[PDB]
């Protein structure tokens, strides 16, 4: 379902499959592959245990971050529609569409492209 | 090994389970099952929704607008702090610290940040019996950021903390001057007169310095202002002041002065 | 029994604002064990009190030891046993207000029960642990007795 | 800030709700989103009425003259049913909302369904409806008055009964009353 | 008296106020402290601190008449685990003798030495 | 002016102010003599405010029998200090001001024209609004 | 389709009681069972309480139209 | 009213005929009501 992440150089599900097929010990491949693919926040590494100590999956954590940032992107694109000089804001919108249209079909990042 | 495969597929079937750092072990158990990884591959290609890519996109997009990244960074950190304060389990945190065998680096990563430091302080407040929380507080003290632990008027009941904060406030007053007389002096007085023990230490130290006149008139002035503020609050601090001075060497006159100053009238 | 509250008080002060009324005196009395303040109005003329006096104060829901919960109309011709036999000053009134250090979330640690004996007011202010027999709009006896110790 | 913190009725803090309401009701007011939508709508209506009052009443003089003395009748309700404003009550806030709304329909001054008639009826009892909403708030009923369900139903009936007796009696000679009531104090001014 | 420990803790255990509770002198006499001395190891730190601070407010005649039990209470306060009680006992030990505060805070109180030194430096700097 | 036009006047008003003071006490004989004059009395002698060493009633206790129904009213006395409501003792008045009537029973306060006169929200006005007109007529007669 | 108030104005009550008392004073049959009262005002008041007064009030609207209300139809204040 | 730095909104004139000629019949009605209220409540009394 990663139609468009191939343009950004993002490793996709096919890459996960081929790494799992050409894997020797699962810990190495899975850990390295999804930790380089994970959110590179320096302080995030300490937050991971505390989320799952109660058994609450970290998927809820990542989805909460996703939803909050989706609210933020909607607000910011509305601000772009409102603030900024006509020429600079139009050029920004054009460039941002050019570099964000790769994920237009995805309902996850659909509001980005749709508002732009 | 069919049930292990079923458990792995149940765990993976939830969307966004790929970002789980735990998945390793679970998926490793799947490699222990010896089954075809086609189900796992298809499910994982169906669960990921580009959360990390969303965060990177959001960062670049917010930088483009013109709003500084400080606001979004602090908003994200506040959300993370809410999540950590709400979903903190002492038992598994202690178990991880015991099983790892060594002090983690990630604890040191959140030691060197103010927001995470306040997170740790509020956790230790909420979870006093959490031993790894106490270890984290110890490491924060080790790192040299002991100022951020409760101080000023909040935690002036401790010996070293009160003495240090009183010394700093006295230095602040003396760096203040005549212009700062109206502003900082009540701020100092409300934290030195919070108790009779802190006030006793303050007045004893004022009397000790007052034996020296090389600018000690400033310390005497500060002590007199503290005395009058304490009287405004309701202290019977005149007996304290007589305990400070040489006047107590004449018990009759000292007792008479205490009488007039507790009464407040010229008998 | 019907004993809502019982303790020993000693009168720390008499009316500090001046004698507002001739026959009634204000008493600021303070406790010994439970450490709760008391503000009371007493008929000084028939029951004189002086500074430093100590007395036993027993607030009771009823005068009868079996707690029959009398209706509350004056029937002097009653031969039943009563508490008023071993007390000197007895007034009957009702509680009309309970304050507290309540917060929006946490419960209350300090209560202050206000009772009116037909005009003569009494505020019993203490920790909430001992003030639980007081429910607003309930009849209450004072049952005060001076101590010789 | 004071108006918000005194009339909003937050449903997020859980300690306060169990302090004020029974446990059978806190889960209802915490779980259902329809209840929270109703409560937010009620507060927004209250804020709009606040602005309307501020444009009707400059200089901030809050001494008004109105038919039913709501606070005294609330006190009467508290004393009749022995409310004991110390234990959590059993009064679902949506009962308060619906009761106020259905009371507002019964106090009719202008009778009719015509849009002109409806506008006249709404304008006639605007001030009293504003006062009624500002007094019988879900939060004020939940933290200040603690009235139970039966007391609240009795109070609604009491307001309806008392208002209908304040209506001007047809055939009243209001002109003579006004003339006398203006002349009489005229004899006693210097 | 009859379980004077509870009496002291409940008269004077207002832990919310670190100040001197009112009429602290009137709650103490020769016999009161004479009974406190043998039961000084059961009461809390707050009650102990209030007692120690109120021992200052006692009248000079009362302090001098029964000064031995005051010395005993101060000594027992110096052996206390709480550093504040140690400091207060060090300050208080000079009352029965002369009346002025003990200026010798230098012993077993390096924090006092640090604060004195840096205050002295700042005072000399801003004369 | 939506206020009463009939009130308590002259020496009846003077004596009701002197009669509800804190230190007014009545023995059983005078209490019975007064209760002989209540038309609305139900025949039950109230429990005295003081039972020992002598059964003594209080002026407020007798007045509460006059007050009709279950009437709730709060006023202030003519000489009520302003600063009292700020400090402590707000609900226990040192000067016995702050007239309070609960359940038709006079809890505290001294009655003056501010509460028994012809003023908006006075005691007789509350009685007329809550009870009928007949009950208020009886209230007037009993007070007098 | 009557639009005037369903309650009884004080003036309607006064005139209705007066008229019914006058009728009873002239040997008109009583619509309620008497318990031993002889004053026509009291009998009329008792009838009005029982809502057995055989009178309908004709209310005149300003426009010239009128509408008729039976006493029992409309609410009695007292 | 036409003078500069003079509020043309709050400025009244205590005179009912002048207000009638300048502002109209509703303005004179409101001003007359306010004047009657001022002359009656001046003693401190109250008329509904």
Author numbering:
A (entry chain V): 1 to 116
B (entry chain W): 40 to 306
C (entry chain H): 2 to 150
D (entry chain A): 914 to 1103
E (entry chain U): 6 to 132
F (entry chain A): 530 to 673
G (entry chain F): 50 to 127
H (entry chain A): 1347 to 1394
According to the publication:
NELF is a large, metazoan-specific protein complex consisting of four subunits, NELF-A, NELF-B, NELF-C/D, and NELF-E. It binds both RNAPII and the nascent RNA transcript emerging from RNAPII and inhibits transcription.
In mode 1, the NELF-AC lobe blocks the RNAPII secondary channel, which is the TFIIS binding site. In the arrested EC structures (AEC1-nuc and AEC2-nuc) formed in the absence of TFIIS, RNAPII is arrested before reaching the nucleosome, although NELF is close to and interacts with the nucleosome. In AEC1-nuc and AEC2-nuc, the RNAPII active site stalls ~25-bp upstream of the nucleosome entry point.
